[PDB]
Design a protein around this motif. Structure first.
Motif, mmCIF file in Angstrom:
data_model
loop_
_atom_site.group_PDB
_atom_site.id
_atom_site.type_symbol
_atom_site.label_atom_id
_atom_site.label_comp_id
_atom_site.label_asym_id
_atom_site.label_seq_id
_atom_site.Cartn_x
_atom_site.Cartn_y
_atom_site.Cartn_z
ATOM 1 N N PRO A 1 0.826 -1.218 0.000
ATOM 2 C CA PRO A 1 0.000 0.000 0.000
ATOM 3 C C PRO A 1 0.853 1.258 0.000
ATOM 4 C CG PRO A 1 -0.001 -0.991 2.177
ATOM 5 C CD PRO A 1 0.733 -1.950 1.275
ATOM 6 N N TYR A 2 2.057 1.145 0.553
ATOM 7 C CA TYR A 2 3.058 2.201 0.501
ATOM 8 C C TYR A 2 4.364 1.572 0.041
ATOM 9 C CZ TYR A 2 -0.400 5.057 2.841
ATOM 10 O OH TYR A 2 -1.550 5.750 3.152
ATOM 11 N N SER A 3 4.936 2.131 -1.029
ATOM 12 C CA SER A 3 5.993 1.466 -1.785
ATOM 13 C C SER A 3 7.285 1.404 -0.989
ATOM 14 C CB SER A 3 6.222 2.192 -3.110
ATOM 15 O OG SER A 3 5.244 1.818 -4.061
ATOM 16 N N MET B 1 11.695 -3.678 -2.609
ATOM 17 C CA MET B 1 12.882 -3.394 -3.413
ATOM 18 C C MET B 1 12.523 -3.250 -4.887
ATOM 19 S SD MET B 1 14.701 -7.123 -2.750
ATOM 20 C CE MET B 1 15.755 -6.956 -4.192
ATOM 21 N N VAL B 2 11.739 -4.182 -5.407
ATOM 22 C CA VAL B 2 11.246 -4.119 -6.775
ATOM 23 C C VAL B 2 10.110 -3.108 -6.866
ATOM 24 C CG1 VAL B 2 10.392 -5.498 -8.690
ATOM 25 C CG2 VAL B 2 11.881 -6.551 -6.981
ATOM 26 N N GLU B 3 10.144 -2.258 -7.893
ATOM 27 C CA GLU B 3 8.953 -1.510 -8.269
ATOM 28 C C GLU B 3 8.764 -1.605 -9.776
ATOM 29 O OE1 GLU B 3 9.449 2.411 -6.691
ATOM 30 O OE2 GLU B 3 10.203 3.289 -8.558
ATOM 31 N N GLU B 4 7.531 -1.894 -10.169
ATOM 32 C CA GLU B 4 7.165 -2.012 -11.567
ATOM 33 C C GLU B 4 6.925 -0.627 -12.144
ATOM 34 O OE1 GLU B 4 3.658 -2.087 -14.518
ATOM 35 O OE2 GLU B 4 3.893 -1.224 -12.516
ATOM 36 N N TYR C 1 -8.621 0.378 4.797
ATOM 37 C CA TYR C 1 -7.815 0.155 5.987
ATOM 38 C C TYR C 1 -7.421 -1.306 6.161
ATOM 39 C CZ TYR C 1 -8.973 4.905 7.595
ATOM 40 O OH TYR C 1 -9.114 6.269 7.712
ATOM 41 N N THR C 2 -7.566 -2.131 5.125
ATOM 42 C CA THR C 2 -7.178 -3.532 5.250
ATOM 43 C C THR C 2 -5.674 -3.749 5.131
ATOM 44 O OG1 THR C 2 -7.885 -3.731 2.926
ATOM 45 C CG2 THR C 2 -9.311 -4.622 4.620
ATOM 46 N N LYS C 3 -4.966 -2.883 4.416
ATOM 47 C CA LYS C 3 -3.540 -3.099 4.189
ATOM 48 C C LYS C 3 -2.765 -2.277 5.208
ATOM 49 C CE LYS C 3 -4.102 -2.134 -0.140
ATOM 50 N NZ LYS C 3 -5.586 -2.185 -0.149
ATOM 51 N N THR C 4 -2.497 -2.908 6.354
ATOM 52 C CA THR C 4 -1.776 -2.319 7.472
ATOM 53 C C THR C 4 -0.667 -3.273 7.892
ATOM 54 O OG1 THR C 4 -3.147 -3.270 9.242
ATOM 55 C CG2 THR C 4 -3.898 -1.190 8.277
ATOM 56 N N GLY C 5 0.422 -2.713 8.430
ATOM 57 C CA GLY C 5 1.583 -3.530 8.759
ATOM 58 C C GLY C 5 1.424 -4.401 9.994
#
Lengths: 129, 61
Positions: free
Chosen positions: A16-18, A21-24, B40-44
């Motif tokens: 969800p937040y880049s 290591m890989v990014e397309e 809010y499903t993608k959380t660490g």
């Protein structure tokens, strides 16, 4: 290590937040042609240096290639199921996160070569050249 | 328990997560509401991840 379990057994990432290591990158636009991005190792996939955790560095280059071979098979048919798919957990005092990566890394190129030399063969065009 | 400061890290994180879904939504109906539980499903942290991994399965019936 859940973005890792997606990118290497398929050709997709989900962060969800880049921070992987890989990014397309996208180079399939209307104004970018198939003869303008020419080979997709040199521009389309890059490796971002400082998002590497530096204990994956020994395989780092290889991690880019794994899902990159798999993705151009997925665009025809998205089932790129592998018998080496397994949950990856970071272990220190052990190198098991080296074994799984190379295990997928060889199988990926084997599958892409077997697909490429049979469908869209490289023998006919080179004979015609 | 020094006035229950350990019993504000078992709650006040559930309630903080359920005050985000109750803040982010504003008159949503249909598919843009199941994109708001998905927001809010993608959380660490597996804690907040494991709460909404159930809420999505409920709401998408």
């Amino acid at each position: 290590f859940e973005v890792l379990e997606k990118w290497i057994y398929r050709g997709i990432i989900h962060d969800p937040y880049s921070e992987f290591m890989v990014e397309e990158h996208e180079l399939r636009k209307e104004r970018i042609q198939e003869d303008y991005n020419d080979k997709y190792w040199d521009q389309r996939y890059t490796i971002v240096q400082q998002q590497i955790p530096s204990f994956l560095q020994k395989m780092a280059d290889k991690i880019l290639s794994t899902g990159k071979y798999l993705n151009v098979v997925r665009e025809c048919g998205h089932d790129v199921t592998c018998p080496v798919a397994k949950e990856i957990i970071y272990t220190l005092k052990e190198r098991a996160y080296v074994e799984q990566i190379e295990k997928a890394f060889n199988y990926a190129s084997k599958v892409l070569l077997d697909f490429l030399m049979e469908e869209k063969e490289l023998v006919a065009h080179l004979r015609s050249i | 328990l020094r006035r229950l400061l350990v019993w504000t890290y078992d709650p006040k994180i559930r309630l903080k997560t359920l005050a985000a879904l109750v803040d982010h939504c504003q008159g949503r109906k249909g598919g843009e509401l199941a994109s708001a539980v998905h927001a809010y499903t993608k959380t660490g942290d597996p804690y907040m991840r494991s709460l909404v991994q159930h809420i999505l399965s409920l709401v998408s019936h």
